[PDB]
Amino acid sequence: VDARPVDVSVSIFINKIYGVNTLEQTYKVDGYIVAQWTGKPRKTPGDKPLIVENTQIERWINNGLWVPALEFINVVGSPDTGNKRLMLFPDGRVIYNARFLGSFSNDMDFRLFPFDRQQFVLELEPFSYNNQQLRFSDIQVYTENIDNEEIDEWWIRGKASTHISDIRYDHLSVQPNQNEFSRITVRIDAVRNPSYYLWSFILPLGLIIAASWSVFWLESFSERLQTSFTLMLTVVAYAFYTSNILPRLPYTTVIDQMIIAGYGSIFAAILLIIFAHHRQANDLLIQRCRLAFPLGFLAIGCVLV
């Protein structure tokens, strides 16, 4: 009196990946989920496959139809299910098809922003049935509807990583091996498009930082010190301009560091400017450090890479 597991074939169609939330480490995914298994044979109208859509699914479940719940382990909140159907074959085959839109979570590191690489994951697992009851026989992923373009925020790798594993829950023991669940894992590699951030942020910041080094080319101490404040004010004006557009993160990115370097370069120049004016006991020599500052900056800049 032993019941063999129900083999479930799964197909996941990915239509869209968008709405990345950096602080929440989440992303939205629109797609379809197809699940096929074999039940007991049945009689259908005209011996042909029977289509049962939406509301009618609940009526078949009420009348005894077994339709296991496949939970998205890493979903944040209940996904928005669109149209859904069952295709009931006379031989006993059952095909569950549903459109979904969900917010999914994954550990995301944006430290290398805007040159960061992310993994968009989907984890699927039966909610109530273990290995001996329900196991995934195969997983097929389709990412055809995602095509790489220069007008795209993210560049997706067509080669999706699919895997079927067994999850052991330490909090379970029906003691002889009844604590393992079948899980489908889909991983989609993505690379951020850095074009916008390179041209609209990094480049003008490099120009502002480079133009702040031109303070040394001013003839008088009065001009050099007073101009340093306008420069400091420019970095502040820029520090915000970026903060208002760039995503919210609990750490510094490459851009944030360039901003800090900007603050330091201007603050260091303020010290040099003052030290040179009160070292003039007879300091025109030190004032001519127009090459030292950029070289020292580019030096510390290279070690930072």
């Epitope: 074939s9 096929q36 026989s137 195969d138 997983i139 097929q140 699919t162 079927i164 079948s182």
Partner: nanobody
């Protein structure tokens, strides 16, 4: 959309042996279970042998001890080693992975 291609089959002497093979091809998939089915001329399609990704095998009682299922995971290939063939083993052997099926290869065991 996984494609299954069966290889081997044909005529074999009663008491002899035969090796069936099946290669699975596709793109973004992962196979856990690979099965071998067979359908006699006046019977229903029955599960002959099954193998998991971990290597655990299960056979129908009619073939236990005689048939042997093996698999190369990386190459998505399943093998069915049929030994001590009998007249009852005369059937169309099918390769199966989830909803996908092989074309079906005939195995005629004669005297």
């Amino acid at each position: 959309q996984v494609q299954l291609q069966e290889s081997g089959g044909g005529l074999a002497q009663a008491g002899g042996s035969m090796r069936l093979s099946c290669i699975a091809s596709g793109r973004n998939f992962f196979i856990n279970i690979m099965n071998w089915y067979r359908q006699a001329p006046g019977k229903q399609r029955e599960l002959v042998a099954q193998i998991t990704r971990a290597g655990t095998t299960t056979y129908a009682d009619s073939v236990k001890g005689r048939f042997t299922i093996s698999r190369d995971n990386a190459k998505n290939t399943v093998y069915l080693q049929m030994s001590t063939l009998q007249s009852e083993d005369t059937a169309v052997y099918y390769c199966n992975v989830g909803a996908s099926w092989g074309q079906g290869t005939q195995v005629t065991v004669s005297s």
